[PDB]
Amino acid sequence: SRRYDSRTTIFSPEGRLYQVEYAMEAIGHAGTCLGILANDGVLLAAERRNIHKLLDEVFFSEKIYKLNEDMACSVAGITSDANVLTNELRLIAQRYLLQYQEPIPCEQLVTALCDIKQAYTQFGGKRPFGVSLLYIGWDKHYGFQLYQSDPSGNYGGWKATCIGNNSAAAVSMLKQDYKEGEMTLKSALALAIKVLNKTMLSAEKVEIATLTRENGKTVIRVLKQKEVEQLIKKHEEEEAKAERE
Amino acid sequence: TTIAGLVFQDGVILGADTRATNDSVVADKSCEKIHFIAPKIYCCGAGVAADAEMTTRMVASKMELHALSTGREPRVATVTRILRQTLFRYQGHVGASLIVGGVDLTGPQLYGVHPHGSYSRLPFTALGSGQDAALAVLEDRFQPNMTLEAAQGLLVEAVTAGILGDLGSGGNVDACVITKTGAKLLRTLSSPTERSGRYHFVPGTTAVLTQTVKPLTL
Amino acid sequence: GSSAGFDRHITIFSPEGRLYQVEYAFKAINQGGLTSVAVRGKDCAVIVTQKKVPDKLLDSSTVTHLFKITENIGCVMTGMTADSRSQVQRARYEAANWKYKYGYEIPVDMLCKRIADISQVYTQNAEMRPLGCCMILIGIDEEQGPQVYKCDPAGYYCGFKATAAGVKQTESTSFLEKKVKKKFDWTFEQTVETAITCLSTVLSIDFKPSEIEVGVVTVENPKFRILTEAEIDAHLVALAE
């Protein structure tokens, strides 16, 4: 028993958690998932790793998950672990709604899952959930919001950020081009496709969604393949128009 | 409620009325009290309507689980055992009086199952508020190994005696013949009882204070 | 045969996808030093194994690998005797509990499935080893006729026309597949004598009455009949020519 124990919930000599770090290496191989805040909305744009001729396309998404009426999220890591965590996020959102009869604020929903992820690093002897999540949402307190989390149970609020394959390369590219306070969703959609062009461009390999507020109610919608493909050609033309001059 | 059952030569027939009463007020005129359990096993619902509903639901699921695992058509002794041991643990608080009828490997079978968890294997039985009228009809004119035609006629006459005689019971006779080759669910097999109406109010007769219209657009 | 981690010590996967602890439970069946054979007739089913009494100080009645699970069902075990008894106790419990819960005689496939599903729990959970033993059930099904059903330490199970398990399993299954291809009127005499001659010619021993033990169920007498040494003696001398 003691011989067979992996001991997932211990500090290594350096002063750090091995299974937490090793889970973040699993994320570094998984698909390029990013998110960008704006004045009039929030977006998530992800690399679609389920790409074959013979795949069916049942669901409205592949990596994007709705959570509440005013909230959604995308993931990077082991998709099975994501299905557990997203199911639990949905449960938390309704547990708040049953209690207070208002939608859960975005930071509160993220802290609730991140308190659970941290438990798997501190006790139980269990391996952590090998998933980083990017969350989007609206609430009455802070409005349009973007959050990141990771297997440690640590979260942060971001204006724009990325996780997955070419994570660091995408964030430094976002640090150049993002203008704080001045970005709209149309300008943000251009930057999302610009960054995914660097990291990964057919529309089967890309998957986008936009959270916005229209007429006192939140509107979460995936983009169709006609909307994505026209935005790809606008990048190809804008890239080529600068190249000549 | 008047429910009843009857064993004949080629199979079993199960009978039931269609009235559902809330205290001394008729809530439903047309409802099915003959429930599905298995392909060749059906069950009549009496007593507490929810307990009759949910136990027959639960045992149907258990027989689907049992049949899928065994790869065999289920036995009628098995539904009786499952019901009994469910009903016995709850000490009659799950108030499901049930007539369980079917055909299997070992022939046609009819069981009376009471809510405390007692049972009785029988050739004919009746349950619910008008059981006595139906059971009086069965005692008067039952014989061993009836024909398919005579059994339907007798079982319709039994459930009809309850329909007229018992204030709880009413409406049409539903029925279910379970021969060897499948089960024929004769819903609305009889109709013992057969207006002017028409109270056309003009639009605007009802006075209105608030009006809001929410368009949907698919 | 690649290996990493604790894959040979506990029931977890090797790099190739095997469970080495499961494979070692099959090797543990051979440690008993015995071979069982089971055969299915037209109107019957029979099981036979070595009733090896080296010590005269043993009570030869209490030395047995044939066991009665219900009236209509009985089995031959082969492997570790402690594991074998334990698996028989659980077969008796599950068979009886079935008749309590469901109100009829448990069929032979479902009893064998039940024990096989229990064996899988040992195959998946690290905390306990698999049982180093092999249960071959026989019994008369009402619809399907006579039945022979083996189940492994891995948690496999299957119905058979004939089967074997133990030391000389591959030789016994090689002998049985030769004889099944030929046409025979598979009577009680035909089925019993095939089982004894298979175990005889594989091991290369002319058996005496005390050197084997026979269990059987017929269409006429479906209750689990364990044959006496006198009844065994009649079938042996029938093969005198």
């Binding site: - | 009376g112 009471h114 009785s120 029988l122 | 009665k68 699970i69 419990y93 009886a96 509990n97 309590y100």
Partner: protein, 199 residues
């Protein structure tokens, strides 16, 4: 209900009525109250039908497995104790009386009562509502060393006498005769009941 078991040289006779009452209503006029626990062990069911059947099922389950674990038929003392311990443990909750009887290779034909979790071997016993009315008759009419036929007569006479007087008892007489040779089941109908004074 009226039940009765009787003991003799190499076996037991065991008898019941057939009426399942629900107050003044007869729910079932043809109920067999002699349930098998093993191949040569029966019990006579009495009191609450739901309680009485559940004990008989649990006793049958327990005695089936107990029989296979010994490689022998169970003793009637064992089956009497199995019914006793269940009836005793849940005596507040259950409202039934299971008279147990059968045959053994060891002690032969024997009859046990288990009234409210007790245990007592008697040469004969009676139970149910109709047993009240026939305590005088069974004291008067019983003598020791009866044959199978004398016991079957005595069990029929007593249960018929009770069925006449008790409203809760009625219908047919079911009879079971247990010996080494086997189990002889027999149904004395309401048509062919032995007549007595009934005015």
């Amino acid at each position: 209900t009226t039940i009765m078991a009787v003991e003799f040289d190499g076996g037991v006779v065991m008898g019941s009525d057939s009426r399942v009452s629900a107050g003044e209503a007869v729910v079932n006029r043809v109920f067999d109250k002699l349930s098998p626990l093993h191949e040569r062990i029966y019990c006579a069911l009495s009191g609450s039908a739901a309680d009485a059947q559940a004990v008989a099922d649990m006793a049958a389950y327990q005695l089936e497995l107990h029989g296979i674990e010994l490689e022998e038929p169970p003793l009637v003392l064992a089956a009497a104790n199995v019914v006793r311990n269940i009836s005793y443990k849940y005596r507040e909750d259950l409202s039934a009386h299971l008279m147990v009887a059968g045959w053994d290779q060891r002690e032969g034909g024997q009859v046990y009562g288990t009234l409210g979790g007790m245990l007592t071997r008697q040469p004969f016993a009676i139970g149910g509502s109709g047993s009240t009315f026939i305590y005088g008759y069974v004291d008067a009419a019983y003598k020791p060393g009866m044959s199978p036929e004398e016991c079957r007569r005595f069990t029929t006479d007593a249960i018929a006498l009770a069925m006449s007087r008790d409203g809760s008892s009625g219908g047919v007489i079911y009879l079971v005769t247990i010996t080494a040779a086997g189990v002889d089941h027999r149904v004395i109908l309401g048509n062919e009941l032995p007549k007595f004074y009934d005015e």
